[PDB]
Motif scaffolding. Structure first.
Motif, PDB file in Angstrom:
ATOM      1  N   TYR A 126     -39.518  81.555 -13.700  1.00 25.72           N
ATOM      2  CA  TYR A 126     -40.478  82.737 -13.708  1.00 25.72           C
ATOM      3  C   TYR A 126     -41.576  82.054 -13.312  1.00 25.72           C
ATOM      4  O   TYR A 126     -42.314  80.446 -13.040  1.00 25.72           O
ATOM      5  CB  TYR A 126     -41.151  82.943 -15.004  1.00 25.72           C
ATOM      6  N   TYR A 171     -47.378  86.977 -10.182  1.00 24.26           N
ATOM      7  CA  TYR A 171     -46.292  86.946 -11.056  1.00 24.26           C
ATOM      8  C   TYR A 171     -44.635  87.297 -10.170  1.00 24.26           C
ATOM      9  O   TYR A 171     -44.722  88.256  -9.795  1.00 24.26           O
ATOM     10  CB  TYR A 171     -45.894  87.870 -11.962  1.00 24.26           C
ATOM     11  N   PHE A 179     -40.718  89.097 -20.354  1.00 24.81           N
ATOM     12  CA  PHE A 179     -41.485  88.854 -21.262  1.00 24.81           C
ATOM     13  C   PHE A 179     -42.031  89.120 -22.966  1.00 24.81           C
ATOM     14  O   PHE A 179     -41.068  90.802 -22.977  1.00 24.81           O
ATOM     15  CB  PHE A 179     -43.169  89.571 -20.379  1.00 24.81           C
ATOM     16  N   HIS A 182     -45.933  92.055 -27.035  1.00 25.47           N
ATOM     17  CA  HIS A 182     -47.355  91.321 -27.434  1.00 25.47           C
ATOM     18  C   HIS A 182     -47.684  91.977 -26.691  1.00 25.47           C
ATOM     19  O   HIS A 182     -48.039  93.672 -26.433  1.00 25.47           O
ATOM     20  CB  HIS A 182     -47.462  90.089 -26.627  1.00 25.47           C
ATOM     21  N   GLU A 184     -52.414  92.402 -25.400  1.00 23.90           N
ATOM     22  CA  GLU A 184     -53.078  91.933 -24.959  1.00 23.90           C
ATOM     23  C   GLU A 184     -54.003  90.732 -25.552  1.00 23.90           C
ATOM     24  O   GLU A 184     -54.699  91.065 -26.617  1.00 23.90           O
ATOM     25  CB  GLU A 184     -53.919  92.174 -23.480  1.00 23.90           C
ATOM     26  N   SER A 190     -54.215  96.173 -20.558  1.00 18.16           N
ATOM     27  CA  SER A 190     -53.276  95.217 -19.138  1.00 18.16           C
ATOM     28  C   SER A 190     -53.539  96.759 -17.378  1.00 18.16           C
ATOM     29  O   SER A 190     -53.183  97.509 -18.179  1.00 18.16           O
ATOM     30  CB  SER A 190     -52.473  94.420 -19.311  1.00 18.16           C
ATOM     31  N   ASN A 192     -50.730  96.941 -14.008  1.00 21.36           N
ATOM     32  CA  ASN A 192     -49.789  95.844 -13.131  1.00 21.36           C
ATOM     33  C   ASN A 192     -50.038  96.746 -12.164  1.00 21.36           C
ATOM     34  O   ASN A 192     -49.167  97.389 -12.518  1.00 21.36           O
ATOM     35  CB  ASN A 192     -48.565  95.225 -14.995  1.00 21.36           C
ATOM     36  N   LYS A 200     -39.048  96.102 -12.841  1.00 24.40           N
ATOM     37  CA  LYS A 200     -39.325  95.811 -14.103  1.00 24.40           C
ATOM     38  C   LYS A 200     -39.106  96.754 -15.390  1.00 24.40           C
ATOM     39  O   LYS A 200     -40.054  97.767 -14.561  1.00 24.40           O
ATOM     40  CB  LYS A 200     -40.346  95.070 -13.782  1.00 24.40           C
ATOM     41  N   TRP A 202     -39.511  97.610 -19.200  1.00 27.68           N
ATOM     42  CA  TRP A 202     -41.071  98.165 -20.073  1.00 27.68           C
ATOM     43  C   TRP A 202     -40.216  98.500 -21.648  1.00 27.68           C
ATOM     44  O   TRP A 202     -39.858  99.851 -21.076  1.00 27.68           O
ATOM     45  CB  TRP A 202     -42.338  98.398 -19.675  1.00 27.68           C
ATOM     46  N   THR A 264     -51.424  99.188 -19.556  1.00 27.00           N
ATOM     47  CA  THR A 264     -51.299  98.956 -21.225  1.00 27.00           C
ATOM     48  C   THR A 264     -51.994  99.133 -21.723  1.00 27.00           C
ATOM     49  O   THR A 264     -53.084  98.945 -21.504  1.00 27.00           O
ATOM     50  CB  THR A 264     -50.454  97.459 -21.970  1.00 27.00           C
ATOM     51  N   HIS A 270     -45.653  95.126 -25.996  1.00 24.70           N
ATOM     52  CA  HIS A 270     -44.294  95.740 -24.684  1.00 24.70           C
ATOM     53  C   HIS A 270     -44.193  94.348 -24.898  1.00 24.70           C
ATOM     54  O   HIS A 270     -44.599  93.055 -24.319  1.00 24.70           O
ATOM     55  CB  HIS A 270     -45.644  95.938 -23.738  1.00 24.70           C
ATOM     56  N   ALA A 282     -51.969  91.768 -12.190  1.00 22.07           N
ATOM     57  CA  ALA A 282     -51.856  91.764 -13.653  1.00 22.07           C
ATOM     58  C   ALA A 282     -52.972  91.910 -14.123  1.00 22.07           C
ATOM     59  O   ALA A 282     -53.750  90.246 -13.398  1.00 22.07           O
ATOM     60  CB  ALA A 282     -51.282  91.510 -14.253  1.00 22.07           C
TER      61      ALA A 282
HETATM   62  O1  LIG Z   1     -45.155  90.740 -15.449  1.00 21.55           O
HETATM   63  C1  LIG Z   1     -45.411  90.430 -16.723  1.00 21.55           C
HETATM   64  O2  LIG Z   1     -44.380  89.542 -16.835  1.00 21.55           O
HETATM   65  C2  LIG Z   1     -45.952  90.577 -17.549  1.00 21.55           C
HETATM   66  N1  LIG Z   1     -47.267  91.522 -17.624  1.00 21.55           N
HETATM   67  C3  LIG Z   1     -48.139  92.472 -19.112  1.00 21.55           C
HETATM   68  O3  LIG Z   1     -47.450  91.775 -19.805  1.00 21.55           O
HETATM   69  C4  LIG Z   1     -48.557  92.898 -18.525  1.00 21.55           C
HETATM   70  O4  LIG Z   1     -48.801  93.846 -16.897  1.00 21.55           O
HETATM   71  O5  LIG Z   1     -49.383  92.995 -19.305  1.00 21.55           O
END
Ligand SMILES: O=C(O)CNC(=O)C(=O)O
Ligand SMILES: [Mg+2]
Ligand code: NI
Ligand SMILES: [Zn+2]
Length: 331
Positions: A126, A171, A179, A182, A184, A190, A192, A200, A202, A264, A270, A282
């Protein structure tokens, strides 16, 4: 109460509605979007983040991270092993190699099944947390490098001027990059944006139910829980949807595609994974409604979570009692 089942909402602003970022966030909240912890925003068809992605290959990923898993398929931790630097062009070629590429699949659900079945048996690499932006400076709407800063929001709401800055992060992902669960830092929002590439997926727990996820995590990761009273701040623990459903934890899921924004909301736990080579940008942001979440945010003081310079002021002003102990964790 709007959105009482805490469903993930999807928004389609017009170009007129896309002008005023703060106003649109407040609109989405008026409709209950925050109750889910996560919302999708599809930009107007006229909007673009930049003209092309043709010239990004020379961006450096100074410290690519190999995400090594331990545990069982639905309940695992990951640690990040540092790898030698490589360019985005080098990383894209790696992501597309036979060892790392996305497998054949029928649809996003099939790929999700394959992710949960097989993730732990592989160690994807990553390129995370790279300071910078891919928005053209001429993009005036929803340009994540031009947002109002969290320090200015705290100053406007509370009257206290503080040091610190607020910049975006890039990223670069590949199949299986992950990910962990968690919220933030300081339970901020956040935003993104998926600039390019593969999707991606989620997962999110409604903010009102976040402590249910925390309780499950303490049961599933019992040594980590003894080590730290906020170990999800370490950003290493994964729990699958199947395990969440078996334990009655409320959650939702959604897949973000290239060209789409996700937001978020404060205290929305998430987690997720990338489908293949992609690039996301992000940044954290605040609104007036965040302030109370910031004041109540948990903190890691064990020393593992180690965060930015700018979080110092947030702790110092919003959490003066915790300040002392939290700073000991940071030093
Ligand atoms: O995209 C990712 O790896 C992680 N991103 C997040 O946790 C976010 O945008 O809050
Ligand atoms: Mg370049
Ligand atoms: Ni996040
Ligand atoms: Zn800790």
């Amino acid at each position: 109460a709007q959105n009482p089942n805490c469903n993930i909402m999807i928004f389609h602003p017009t170009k007129e509605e896309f002008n005023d970022f703060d106003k649109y966030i407040a609109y989405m909240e008026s409709q209950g979007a925050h109750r889910a912890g996560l919302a999708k925003i599809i930009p107007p068809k006229e909007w673009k983040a930049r003209e092309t992605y043709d010239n990004i290959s020379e961006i450096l990923i100074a410290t690519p991270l190999q995400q090594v898993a331990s545990g069982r398929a639905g309940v695992f931790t990951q640690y990040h092993k540092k790898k030698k630097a490589m360019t985005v062009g080098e990383y894209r070629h790696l992501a597309n190699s036979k060892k790392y590429q996305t497998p054949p699949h029928q649809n996003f659900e099939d790929l999700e099944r394959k992710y949960w079945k097989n993730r732990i048996y592989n160690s994807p690499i990553y390129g995370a947390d790279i300071s910078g932006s891919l928005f053209d400076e001429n993009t005036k709407q929803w340009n994540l490098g031009h947002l109002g800063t969290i320090q200015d929001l705290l100053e406007k709401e509370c009257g206290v001027v503080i040091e610190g800055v607020n910049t975006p992060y890039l990223y670069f992902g590949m199949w299986k990059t992950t990910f962990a669960w968690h919220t933030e830092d300081m339970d901020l929002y956040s935003i993104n944006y998926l600039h390019l590439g593969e999707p991606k997926t989620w997962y999110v727990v409604p903010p009102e139910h976040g402590q249910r996820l925390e309780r499950l995590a303490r049961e599933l990761f019992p040594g980590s829980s003894r080590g730290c009273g906020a170990f999800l701040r370490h950003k290493v623990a994964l729990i699958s949807p199947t395990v969440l459903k078996e334990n009655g934890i409320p959650f939702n899921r959604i897949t973000q595609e290239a060209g789409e924004f996700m937001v978020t909301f404060p205290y929305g736990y998430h987690a997720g994974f990338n489908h293949g080579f992609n690039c996301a940008e992000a940044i954290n942001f605040a609104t007036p409604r965040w302030i109370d979440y910031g004041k109540m945010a948990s903190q890691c003081s064990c020393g593992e979570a180690r965060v930015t310079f700018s979080m110092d002021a947030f702790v110092r002003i919003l959490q003066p009692e915790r300040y002392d102990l939290w700073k000991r964790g940071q030093d």
